[PDB]
Amino acid sequence: SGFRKMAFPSGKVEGCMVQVTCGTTTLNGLWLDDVVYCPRHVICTSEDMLNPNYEDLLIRKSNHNFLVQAGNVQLRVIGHSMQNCVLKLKVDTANPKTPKYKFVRIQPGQTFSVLACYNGSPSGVYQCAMRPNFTIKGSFLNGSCGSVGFNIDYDCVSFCYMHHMELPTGVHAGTDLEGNFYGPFVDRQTAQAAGTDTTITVNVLAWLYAAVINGDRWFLNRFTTTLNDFNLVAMKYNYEPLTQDHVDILGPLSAQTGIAVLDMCASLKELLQNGMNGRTILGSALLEDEFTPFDVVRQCSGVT
Amino acid sequence: SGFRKMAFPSGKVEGCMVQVTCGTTTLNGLWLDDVVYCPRHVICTSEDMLNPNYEDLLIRKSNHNFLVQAGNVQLRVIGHSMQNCVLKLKVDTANPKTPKYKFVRIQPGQTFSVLACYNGSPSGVYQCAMRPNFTIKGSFLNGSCGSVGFNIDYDCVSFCYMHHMELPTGVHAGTDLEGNFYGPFVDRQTAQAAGTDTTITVNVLAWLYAAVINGDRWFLNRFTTTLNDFNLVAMKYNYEPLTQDHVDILGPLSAQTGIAVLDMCASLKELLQNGMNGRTILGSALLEDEFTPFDVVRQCSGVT
Ligand SMILES: O=C(NCCNc1ccccc1)c1cc(=O)[nH]c2ccccc12
Ligand SMILES: O=C(NCCNc1ccccc1)c1cc(=O)[nH]c2ccccc12
């Protein structure tokens, strides 16, 4: 029992982290097989970030300008290419620590672990959700660029995020491993609107099922609701509309606890309309939305 | 910017996890050098846990009864000994993945990362605080015993906790790596009182300094207090009394933000007496006490 914001074990990812330096800028790279992936903004100077012409800037760079170091080992760069907002540095050595991996583009509302790195060294791991507005509420300082997000299924690492920047609002933006930004963000030092965010409704319900499984039951009530009625409430409180697809994915947690999805929606409706009244749920005083139905089952069943 | 309940990268610890089986019971072991450490309750059956006579039970066991497997590799056990509540299985092979390590007994209020494991396989990592009452509010299921807590300073892993049991109250108890339980707990299936817990005051103040560094400033006020006045309030709200040692350790965060420790105590006093008024601090709706002053500086400075 107990419920924590648990991250995947970062071991398989630590073995891929490298440091990439170009000119005077240093950031993190991801070494998989004979390729090192890093944000293309490694080629910019402080002056360049106002409106960088990445194609022009990369043309001044040669393989020998990209310095790649894995711990105390220097990698020989035999090729470079830009794909969207990432650079792919071909190296002459396959990473001996390359785990089985995939590159995936996660959907908003999904979760993943971030291994925050500086100078190619891992400093910490934490679990995040990709916000509905395609930002992540990370924890990243100068030099954290190139740090990646991921999920692990048995022995396979699905890399889903690479960190590129922090917005003035203190939230984070980045790309999938093909260099495509999540959201409307551009790798330019300009004011960038992150859309209106919403609370991930299916994850809050999943977290309420985790609370029930763990014994925190006070929020359960004698009421039920309908998808239509519940979504009128969700709209008012800036929660994502609940769909039948969300109800279906909540099926296993519904079966585990014997609490029908719409009945759990009625507890959520009452918590939105009345607040927590100074009580807590799983040690939290607000409604948590960073656990998916899959994370809840995994944490409550023990998948390794 | 941003602030997360960040765990250490678990890589160095994943490389030490093994599975230990004795009879029909399986749990996790920690393989460091040529020794495997695991909870001594691995030798008990379901019937034995009422009041186990561990010395008598271990006498029926031979080296060949302890089955130790590291992934797909079987370790040969050449020796066994009980030290307090842990068993130490001497194996004929030094773990090639043994990092530089130490065994430390942490103090209450200190934090550490837990790598939750099942069948010798790591499932997740999360950051914990050792409660003032010597419990940990973990997330652990059947088979999680032998999972360890730790801190990492550059290349050195300081192992501080090994998981042994879950109390009826759903909180967790365990030992240091010499098998000494933290708190009054015994490895017996009996009702066990965990003392009155308290909020770790120095950690809440440290977390308030992290909030200020990150821009969450609304709780700052025009007031100051004294250690005596502040502790009258701390007593009323079951917070640990603040000492000059705590003030001293908060020195760096005081210097960073230019907010004197006693002035930050006055903000904490007002938050305890008036609540949060439906506002949040670092995404939390309650006062967080699982970040030490050291964790705050590390997360806000970027130590790898
Ligand atoms: O290193 C960072 N940025 C460099 C790329 N800077 C850029 C990239 C794209 C567009 C505009 C500017 C950085 C990352 C972060 O998440 N938090 C920070 C906190 C303080 C100082 C810097 C950081
Ligand atoms: O495996 C666990 N215990 C076995 C040792 N059981 C024992 C050990 C010492 C004293 C009395 C009994 C266990 C650990 C945990 O933290 N959460 C659980 C949740 C459900 C089922 C079991 C667990």
From Swiss-Prot, chains A, B:
The entry's stated outcome for L205V is:
In strain: Zeta/P.2
Coiled-coil annotated spans: none
What reaction is this protein's catalytic activity? TSAVLQ-|-SGFRK-NH2 and SGVTFQ-|-GKFKK the two peptides corresponding to the two self-cleavage sites of the SARS 3C-like proteinase are the two most reactive peptide substrates. The enzyme exhibits a strong preference for substrates containing Gln at P1 position and Leu at P2 position
Crosslink Glycyl lysine isopeptide (Lys-Gly) (interchain with G-Cter in ubiquitin): position given as K5, K90
Q: What is the effect of changing M49A?
A: Does not affect ability to cleave and inactivate human TRMT1
**Where, subcellularly, is it found?**
Host cytoplasm; Host Golgi apparatus; Host nucleus
How is the activity of this protein regulated? Inhibited by pyridone-containing alpha-ketoamides compounds 13a and 13b. In turn, alpha-ketoamide 13b (tert-butyl (1-((S)-1-(((S)-4-(benzylamino)-3,4-dioxo-1-((S)-2-oxopyrrolidin-3-yl)butan-2-yl)amino)-3-cyclopropyl-1-oxopropan-2-yl)-2-oxo-1,2-dihydropyridin-3-yl)carbamate) inhibits SARS-CoV-2 replication in human lung cells. Inhibited ex vivo by michael acceptor inhibitor N3. Inhibited ex vivo by compound 11a and 11b.
Look up what happens after changing Q189A: Does not affect ability to cleave and inactivate human TRMT1
Q: Where is the Peptidase C30 domain?
A: 1-304
Substituting K90R results in:
In strain: Beta/B.1.351
Topology: which residues are Cytoplasmic?
1-304
Summarize the subunit comment.
3CL-PRO exists as monomer and homodimer. Only the homodimer shows catalytic activity. Interacts with host FBXO22; this interaction promotes the proteasomal degradation of nsp5.
Protein name per Swiss-Prot or TrEMBL: 3C-like proteinase nsp5
Organism the protein comes from: Severe acute respiratory syndrome coronavirus 2
> Which gene carries the instructions for this protein?
rep
